[PDB]
Design an enzyme around this catalytic site. Structure first.
Site, PDB file in Angstrom:
ATOM      1  N   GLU A  35      -2.127  12.738  18.087  1.00  0.00           N
ATOM      2  CA  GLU A  35      -1.950  11.503  17.339  1.00  0.00           C
ATOM      3  C   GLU A  35      -3.296  10.811  17.110  1.00  0.00           C
ATOM      4  OE1 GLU A  35       0.644  10.799  15.559  1.00  0.00           O
ATOM      5  OE2 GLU A  35       2.436  11.306  16.646  1.00  0.00           O
ATOM      6  N   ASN A  46       0.497   5.836   6.164  1.00  0.00           N
ATOM      7  CA  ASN A  46       1.594   6.711   5.775  1.00  0.00           C
ATOM      8  C   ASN A  46       1.840   6.661   4.254  1.00  0.00           C
ATOM      9  OD1 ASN A  46       2.264   7.544   8.483  1.00  0.00           O
ATOM     10  ND2 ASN A  46       3.183   5.516   8.766  1.00  0.00           N
ATOM     11  N   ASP A  48       4.635   6.243   2.725  1.00  0.00           N
ATOM     12  CA  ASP A  48       5.534   5.117   2.380  1.00  0.00           C
ATOM     13  C   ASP A  48       4.834   3.803   2.420  1.00  0.00           C
ATOM     14  OD1 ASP A  48       5.433   4.368   5.136  1.00  0.00           O
ATOM     15  OD2 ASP A  48       7.607   4.196   5.332  1.00  0.00           O
ATOM     16  N   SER A  50       3.497   2.305   5.139  1.00  0.00           N
ATOM     17  CA  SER A  50       3.337   1.777   6.473  1.00  0.00           C
ATOM     18  C   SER A  50       2.029   2.367   7.072  1.00  0.00           C
ATOM     19  CB  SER A  50       4.556   2.125   7.342  1.00  0.00           C
ATOM     20  OG  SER A  50       4.667   3.529   7.420  1.00  0.00           O
ATOM     21  N   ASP A  52       0.202   3.650  10.964  1.00  0.00           N
ATOM     22  CA  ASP A  52       0.354   4.030  12.359  1.00  0.00           C
ATOM     23  C   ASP A  52      -0.849   3.539  13.164  1.00  0.00           C
ATOM     24  OD1 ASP A  52       2.604   5.580  11.510  1.00  0.00           O
ATOM     25  OD2 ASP A  52       1.482   7.408  11.586  1.00  0.00           O
ATOM     26  N   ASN A  59       4.234   3.196  14.303  1.00  0.00           N
ATOM     27  CA  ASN A  59       4.265   2.836  12.894  1.00  0.00           C
ATOM     28  C   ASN A  59       4.796   1.397  12.626  1.00  0.00           C
ATOM     29  OD1 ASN A  59       7.192   2.860  11.670  1.00  0.00           O
ATOM     30  ND2 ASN A  59       7.058   4.660  13.025  1.00  0.00           N
ATOM     31  N   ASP A 101      15.388   5.411  21.545  1.00  0.00           N
ATOM     32  CA  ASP A 101      16.135   5.017  20.341  1.00  0.00           C
ATOM     33  C   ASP A 101      17.152   6.034  19.818  1.00  0.00           C
ATOM     34  OD1 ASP A 101      14.959   6.858  18.464  1.00  0.00           O
ATOM     35  OD2 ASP A 101      13.546   5.364  17.676  1.00  0.00           O
TER      36      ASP A 101
END
Length: 129
Positions: A35, A46, A48, A50, A52, A59, A101
């Site tokens: 990462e 990202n 989209d 967003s 990280d 994110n 989650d």
């Protein structure tokens, strides 16, 4: 801060990630490696829109507020910038919510593609824990 491998292993162990939801320490160290290369300051955008943040590339689509991610949530209730501190407490706290989650560490795509099904305990080899 750029952590040494074993230094990050020990910090993560202190903060309760060793076997958190069945994920042995080496899983979290391998995730961090791919990462962020262990760099608390890592940021990546990202597709989209967003972004990280931090050692585990958490994110802003769901987990933190960066002030610029339209139609996102802040389920960890933190500014994303808190995820870049040299102190990993916020990243660890937030990761514990993420991994709880439903999808476990599959929430980290780099974990699924780089760590899952590998000998992750190699990442903690030689470390004082």
């Amino acid at each position: 801060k750029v952590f040494g491998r074993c230094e990050l292993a020990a910090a993560m162990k202190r903060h309760g990630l060793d076997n958190y939801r069945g994920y042995s320490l080496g899983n979290w160290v391998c995730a961090a490696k791919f990462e962020s290369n262990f760099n608390t300051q890592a940021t990546n955008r990202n597709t989209d829109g967003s972004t990280d943040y931090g050692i585990l590339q958490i994110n802003s689509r769901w987990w933190c507020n960066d002030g610029r991610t339209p139609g996102s949530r802040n389920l960890c209730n933190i500014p994303c910038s808190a995820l870049l501190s040299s102190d990993i407490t916020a990243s660890v706290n937030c990761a514990k919510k993420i991994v709880s989650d439903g999808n476990g560490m599959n929430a980290w795509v780099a974990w699924r593609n780089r760590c899952k099904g590998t000998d992750v305990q190699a990442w903690i080899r030689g470390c004082r824990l």
